[PDB]
């Protein structure tokens, strides 16, 4: 779409200063999620601990002792009452943060999948979309715990998930370089997204809701649509010879936050695919990344047990 | 203001301390992981422990706690979850000596010995387990010596020609598995004979993980 958008260009160099660095973890971080309040964020690490961090004061609200230390995903519900954590054990132990007691008690465990749990996202306090490593996704409940709708259309292992602003339809990419826009009402994909060549690792929706970014392990990102489904731009560059572990957008959908696994993050232009900023400072490969719904700061997580906040 | 934020920081600093011992309790214990292809003979290593998703086993021996993980049945490719175990003490391997004659029941064209050897190189030569030691076990040594007096053993390796004796082949295939590794300057490979007879080989893996944690302690001191 470079022939369109003649009015815009890379806005100098986006210099996001490191404001907060969350300390306390002792293992490799693998997942995180934000909320609308933009003050409490969940984070999962390989030490078997689920921490509810305070964004403004770098304090730990809750410390959930996980039963399985090999957790690979974690979600934060918009209500702020429940948080999920899936991993190799395939037991999505959804805990209850706001409880009458002091310790965090588990609300419902989800042990119906067979492949490794890769990503989970809370639709609401009743429905949750959780992917797995058996080339399928499923919609789960909390009060009873079952699979309302199982999406079986991918030939590769799912890696990441992403929810739309209305949470009625979601895209999801797999290791077979194939993404599909699944529906929550009827429960089946409408059109697939096959534009990459390597294992898709990260998926994130566009703030408008008519597009989404895709991050594969071939050192490039792409932006697909939901109406005509044709690739508009490619975030390819010869300076990147590494993989991709995370991708996200800002509040305005202009600065794409691409968490490349080369120890540094990259702030890409979501309209011209130009390098606008490079977030460096992480001592290890990043695995998770999330932008607040408010848009104030951006939290990046690496395997160095450090969660850096950029603003 | 320090009105209620002091109690919030005190609560955070309270679980900051609690999470510190939990990291130390997990650091003093040995974390092991075992791999293997179909019919890997892992029933031996999981039986010596005092006791969908993977199986995990706890067992304490010689005043030392071990955290062994059983992969079991994982249809997913290892490329997307083998980097999670980056940091284990010593990854365990279980190769079956009876895999030289029997072929895999997948395409009728791949030998089980070559398939297990292809999995040994895929696990060893990676960007995650460069430093972690490998402890491979030769399971079913009595079943292997019973078939070697009837088979020329050339089925797996056609370029080999030697003695059809257990002590000869157990040492020959030991050096063979010690040639597919390229990180001979960083990691260490252990080999032992496991079976139902002459059991209780945990003294070997206990001395093996003791060698690794000391090598890790030497890295803590800054001597390597």
């Amino acid at each position, epitope marked *: 779409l470079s022939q369109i958008t003649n009015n815009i260009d890379p806005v100098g160099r986006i210099q996001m200063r490191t404001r907060r660095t969350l300390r306390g973890h002792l293992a490799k971080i693998y997942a995180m999620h934000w909320g609308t309040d933009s*003050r*409490l964020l969940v984070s999962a690490s390989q030490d078997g601990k689920l921490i509810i961090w*305070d964004s*403004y004061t770098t*304090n730990k*609200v*809750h410390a959930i002792p996980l039963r399985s230390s090999w957790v690979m995903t974690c979600a934060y519900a918009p209500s*702020g009452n429940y948080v999920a954590c899936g991993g190799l054990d395939n037991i999505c132990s959804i805990y209850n943060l*706001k409880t*009458r*007691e*002091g*310790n965090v008690r588990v609300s419902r465990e989800l042990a119906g999948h067979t492949g490794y749990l890769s990503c989970c996202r809370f639709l609401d306090d009743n429905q949750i979309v959780t992917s797995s490593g058996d080339t399928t996704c499923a919609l789960w409940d909390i009060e009873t715990g079952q699979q309302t709708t199982t999406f079986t259309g991918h030939t590769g292992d799912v890696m990441s998930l992403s929810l739309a602003p209305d949470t009625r339809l979601f895209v999801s990419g797999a290791c077979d370089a194939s993404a599909k826009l699944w529906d929550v009402r009827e429960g089946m994909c409408r059109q697939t997204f096959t534009g990459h060549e390597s294992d898709i690792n990260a998926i994130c929706f566009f703030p408008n809701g008519n597009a989404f970014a895709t991050g594969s392990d071939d050192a490039t990102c792409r932006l697909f649509d939901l109406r005509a489904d044709q690739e508009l731009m490619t975030y390819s560059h010869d300076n990147i010879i590494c993989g991709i572990t995370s991708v996200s957008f800002s509040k305005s959908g202009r600065l794409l936050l691409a968490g490349y696994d080369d120890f540094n993050c990259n702030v890409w232009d979501a309209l011209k695919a130009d390098r606008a900023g490079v977030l460096a400072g992480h001592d290890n490969r990043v695995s998770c990344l999330g932008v607040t719904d408010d848009g104030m700061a951006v939290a990046t997580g690496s395997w160095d047990s450090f969660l850096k906040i950029w603003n | *203001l320090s*009105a*209620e*934020d*002091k*109690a*919030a920081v*005190e*609560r955070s600093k*309270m679980i900051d301390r609690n999470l510190r011992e939990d990291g130390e309790k997990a650091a003093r214990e040995v974390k092991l992981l075992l791999l293997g292809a179909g019919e890997s003979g892992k029933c031996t290593i999981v039986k010596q422990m005092k006791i969908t998703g993977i199986v995990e086993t706890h067992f304490t021996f010689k005043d030392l706690h071990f955290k062994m993980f059983d992969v079991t049945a994982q249809r997913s490719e290892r490329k997307k979850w083998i980097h999670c175990f980056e940091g284990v003490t010593a990854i365990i391997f279980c190769v079956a000596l009876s895999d030289y004659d029997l072929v895999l029941a997948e395409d009728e064209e791949m030998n089980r010995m070559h398939a297990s050897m292809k999995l040994f190189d895929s696990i060893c030569n990676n960007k995650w387990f460069t430093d972690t030691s490998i402890i491979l076990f030769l399971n079913k040594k009595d079943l292997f010596e019973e078939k070697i007096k009837k088979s020329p053993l050339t089925i797996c390796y056609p370029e080999y020609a030697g003695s059809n004796t257990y002590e000869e082949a157990a040492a020959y295939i030991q050096c063979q598995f010690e040639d597919l590794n390229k990180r001979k300057d960083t990691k260490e490979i252990y080999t032992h004979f496991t079976c139902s007879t002459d059991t209780k080989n945990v003294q070997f893996v206990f001395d093996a993980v003791t060698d690794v944690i000391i090598k890790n302690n030497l890295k803590d001191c800054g001597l390597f």
Partner: single-chain antibody
Amino acid sequence: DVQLVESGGGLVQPGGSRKLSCSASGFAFSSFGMHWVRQAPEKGLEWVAYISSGSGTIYYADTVKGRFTISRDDPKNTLFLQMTSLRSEDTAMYYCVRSIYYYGSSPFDFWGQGTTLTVSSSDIVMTQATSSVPVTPGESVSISCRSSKSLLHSNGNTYLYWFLQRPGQSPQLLIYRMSNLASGVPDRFSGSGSGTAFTLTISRLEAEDVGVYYCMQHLEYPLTFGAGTKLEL
């Protein structure tokens, strides 16, 4: 089921000690800040002592500083309050309150039954400018409260807590942070205010809203409660 029962039933003679006990059940006693609130017959509440998780921060009120001693037992889930050098002003109920401190938390949720002990005969002043409002159900009721210091902080929230005490029962939280209702309270209590003046409006009053109202601040120690707005039918 959260439960806070106290023991030590009996009047004390001036010149000794009582050292009452308080056990907990239904919740993690180790991860809650225990508070002590006194209330003489038809009098305003008053904070006495507060201990945090792990006996780290132990604060006392100037009325009890140097006289009373608090000691908790995490393995026992029992709170021991050693009270020595007692006098006639120590006659109260000695409520035990639990509280956890974090963003979005609900401090002062559950109140203990208390032990009505009798004896053989600067700080932020919270004023309500009203002690009794006899109003039958049928119209809305609004209760205000003032403060000696502005409760508006730099982070944004206003630390204010409302407590309703029914005759023969223990108080319980109404609205924390001056705009957020606690768990188990219907959307009838709407808290408003700015800095010093505050307002608690009740759209429809029932038999559950008839009681004494207290406006407590959590800025500085010792904590001070309101004057007490009693309702009549």
